[PDB]
Amino acid sequence: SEFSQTALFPSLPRTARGTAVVLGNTPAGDKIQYCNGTSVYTVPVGSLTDTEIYTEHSHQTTVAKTSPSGYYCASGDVHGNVRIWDTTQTTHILKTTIPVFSGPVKDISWDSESKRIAAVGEGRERFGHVFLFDTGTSNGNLTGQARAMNSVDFKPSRPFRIISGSDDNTVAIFEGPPFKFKSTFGEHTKFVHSVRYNPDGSLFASTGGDGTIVLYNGVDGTKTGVFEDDSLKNVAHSGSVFGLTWSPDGTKIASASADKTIKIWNVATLKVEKTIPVGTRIEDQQLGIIWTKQALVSISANGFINFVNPELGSIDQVRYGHNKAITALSSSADGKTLFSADAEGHINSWDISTGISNRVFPDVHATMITGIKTTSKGDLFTVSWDDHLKVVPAGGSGVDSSKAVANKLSSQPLGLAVSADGDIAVAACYKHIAIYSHGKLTEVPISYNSSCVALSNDKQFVAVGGQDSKVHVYKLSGASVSEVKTIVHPAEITSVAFSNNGAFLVATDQSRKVIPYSVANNFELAHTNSWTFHTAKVACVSWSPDNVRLATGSLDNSVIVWNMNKPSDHPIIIKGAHAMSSVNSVIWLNETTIVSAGQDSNIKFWNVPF
Ligand SMILES: [Mn+2]
The missing domain is CATH 2.130.10.10 (YVTN repeat-like/Quinoprotein amine dehydrogenase)
Known part of the structure; x- marks a missing residue:
């Protein structure tokens, strides 16, 4: 009163040199989500003053994702907790909090029904866990990779699958529910930082430290091709690729790289379409990216939020801060x-x-x-x-x-x-x-x-x-x-x-x-x-x-x-x-x-x- x-x-998102930053978003794509401190920020694409903040984790927050239904947000922290809370009211009542493993949560994925959550990271007893958002009930096993799982994603269509990328250089796929290991793929020669399904679930792509971007069949993980940039030799980027994301219509993929560029790719031709340099300084390396129905945003190592113009192949707005x-x-x-x-x-x-x-x-x-x-x-x-x-x-x-x-x-x-x-x-x-x-x-x-x-x-x-x-x-x-x-x-x-x-x-x-x-x-x-x-x-x-x-x-x-x-x-x-x-x-x-x-x-x- x-x-x-x-x-x-x-606050800008927390960033660390050479470390991927993972973003979340609301269903309509009008807001993105990122973490800093022990908070989760839901930042609007169309407002510089109405960002919302959720501050209930006691440990440093790592990744936060809003369900497809838009009603819940699942956020992880460095301790291995994934808190699932109401997004609709300022009280943000906690639905469930689950200790997925002892260690940092690196990525979180909601299934298309807003019923399941797969969380992955560096854990002492396991690197990944899949469960029900509302009860914490285990919905499978994600055993299969030998080192930290850095990225995870549900196939939005049936039959259901979960894909993951790991520090062991492999990409794994699980079938379910209940979920269990199906196959592993060794196209990569360095850490896999990002794996994502397209909107209709017919395909998924992977990328990471070796600078290549691989495309695969959505149901069985069979490689269908690799992305090409005619200015480079057998690589999509000349440095580590920290993340990729698909356009809402699935016809394009955007990638963020240590080479300081954001690249937009034509999925059908498997060729680069636009190369967008952010800067020449070490802080201009791109560490995370996400494409929503309203914006394509990439994050610089300095924490800056870059709004990309995919048509013009340039940067439209840069939001600064601390x-x-x-x-x-x-x-x-x-x-x-x-x-x-x-x-x-x-x-x-x-x-x-x-x-x-x-x-x-x-x-x-x-x-x-x-x-x-x-x-x-x-x-x-x-x-x-x-x-x-x-x-x-x-x-x-x-x-x-x-x-x-x-x-x-x-x-x-x-x-x-x-x-x-x-x-x-x-x-x-x-x-x-x-x-x-x-x-x-x-x-x-x-x-x-x-x-x-x-x-x-x-x-x-x-x-x-x-x-x-x-x-x-x-x-x-x-x-x-x-x-x-x-x-x-x-x-x-x-x-x-x-x-x-x-x-x-x-x-x-x-x-x-x-x-x-x-x-x-x-x-x-x-x-x-x-x-x-x-x-x-x-x-x-x-x-x-x-x-x-x-x-x-x-x-x-x-x-x-x-x-x-x-x-x-x-x-x-x-x-x-x-x-x-x-x-x-x-x-x-x-x-x-x-x-x-x-x-x-x-x-x-x-x-x-x-
Ligand atoms: Mn997904």
Whole structure:
């Protein structure tokens, strides 16, 4: 009642170099599914803001597939669990959870009747299991391959069959129900990463590390041919092929390869039809792909989602973002753009009204970014664990990471504050307070270890939170600071912020407390109420433009909105704001709109009325 999520700029799928990514989809093909963290993302092809998230696995999610009926989703994790849950309601009630084997689930396949599920992976006692979705009842045995089963698929037509690809280089076929081994095929010479039946079940194809794509008769697995690219010698791709998928009408196959291309094939002629290069960088390798009734999507090693135009043979849309923990957020002065940074140094720009993303490239840092701030002139200041404070300019395309000023710091930067106009920047470091005013990086040693910093709107005060449980407030004269007040907290300071009108300074700490101070009154307590509603370390704080409300994000997964005009009132608690994830950054876009970002790679927008 007190708030509502109005938009989500979702996490990209989890990816690992040279590792296949498996996608799922809704019956109509209007949404794709992928995993990151302990979550399952159902991402719409026609919306950049309405992705749905299911977060109930306790272990890292691997693959998720929605049944042909569209009513259930079966998702696996690295532990070997396959949870089958309702997709129709936000409560997502669990139907069944089955421990298929001890180890990671790599692929899942629903039969055409939405009655059976075959799950495969790396398991101690077996590599695959087939069973009933609703009861967990075994519906056969998938014994037959000697190493991890990487891909599995049901024949959608009768007689029923199940095919699988394995690290033992073979493709196996099972007949049923009940299902049992029928044959093995050794056309491949390296790991088989993907096996898929066409829509009518008359044929299936396989591919993998040896770069070839084989076509087979759907009922008995007899090879009918191999795909040819006349520019290559006896291979479909010049590198590993991580996945293939069939067009809805079965006349074409699309493949994703380490060779950095997506290729579309003509099934009838067995010849390549379009070759679509994604890029020339190592991150442009394609690790997964799926063709739905509404879109053909391929995934880059960097997690980017590429929407392919099969007619033109090109890439239509690329959705960027993060798959690593987001650590900082900063919006542009005009409120049209949002910048987000992560734990691996990546930064993305987002158009706030549409959700359209852009990955900053080149990369400003190669490691953790502990802060980023925009200036009324379009620059973006940043600090990272590589002990550098960099200033990215505007020239190349929006923010020119093309090339700009890097300054070594004497100690690691933990926090960053910058004046609106960019005239002054202060970085709170492990052993120093670094001040940046037009070229001169002036460093002031401190006796304690800092943890965060805030600069008053009028540039007169610099508040430095410390690991000594004190907020050190300094008056800033040029490139020098003089401590005018030392505020004591019960535990280490975690974040600080000044209201835009300079009326208040707020500090949060590891004891889960949020404490505001009256600036005009020598930083005395602004009120005496106990703002201890978070149940875990508070990670961030930010003031509303109205200088009265503020918000905090915590490791307890929540965002809490506080009201300075009613300190005894219960605050607004957005519980589970980021499910099973710390909320690392929160900022206000206006007096009733908050944006939060989490360890989960998600960026959420919240409408919070008065
Ligand atoms: Mn299938």
